[PDB]
């Protein structure tokens, strides 16, 4: 477990979090587009 923690201490998860946020934003944009299409 200590070896695994030392390996994971890279702290590169920021890129993964940013990618997840971008995917969520894309999903929100798609939902907004669908709502706009439904309105018209």
| Interface size with a second copy, residues (CB under 8 A) | 20
Under rule CB under 8 A, residue 2 binds a second copy: no
Q: Which of 4, 5, 10, 38 binds a second copy (CB under 8 A)?
A: 38
State the DSSP H helix or E strand holding residue 6, giving kind and residue range, or none if neither: helix 2-8
Residue closer to a second copy (CB basis): 8 or 28:
28
Least distance (Å) between residue 7 CB and a second copy = 17
């Amino acid at each position: 477990v200590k070896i695994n923690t030392k390996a994971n201490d890279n702290s590169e998860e920021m890129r993964h979090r940013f990618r997840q946020l971008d995917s969520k934003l894309n999903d929100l944009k798609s939902l907004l587009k669908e709502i706009a299409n439904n309105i018209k």
